[PDB]
Amino acid sequence: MNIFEMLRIDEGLRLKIYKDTEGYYTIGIGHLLTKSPSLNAAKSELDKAIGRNTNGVITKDEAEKLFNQDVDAAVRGILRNAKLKPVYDSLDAVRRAALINMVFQMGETGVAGFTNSLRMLQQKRWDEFAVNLAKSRWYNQTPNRAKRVITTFRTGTWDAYK
Ligand SMILES: [Cl-]
Secondary structure: OOHHHHHHHHHOOEEEEEEOOOOOEEEEOOEEEEOOOOHHHHHHHHHHHHOOOOOOEOOHHHHHHHHHHHHHHHHHHHHOOOOHHHHHHHOOHHHHHHHHHHHHHHHHHHHHOOHHHHHHHHHOOHHHHHHHHOOOHHHHHOHHHHHHHHHHHHHOOOHHHO
């Protein structure tokens, strides 16, 4: 099991534009198009991203390319984040995945603003960071997913995904 497997599951796969839970144009494996409410606008960005005239739909492979880049970008954003790095650098492998999953979902910045839960993760105080992350808009907006992620951080295992 690894980050790729993890997020594919957490995000699913769509070949067609779709709207998320926040109601945003999205595609593939949680690949955010635009926050704007113009399907057109979303079509353009999709085109720009795929590099061809898509007319709203991509292929699996296309989806997969966006995804690999999306995971790469998340990794680099972590490594480049002054708040994120050390955290990341201090966790074992399962947990870095979890850190990566959240960054994928909210952005360096977003994730970087959980400064209290970050310390805790730093102290390796699983149980409490966990309680802490739960008091998040994030946890209530999408509790099941949020729970897997948080369990993964807590335990440092993949049980939530098996
Ligand atoms: Cl792109």
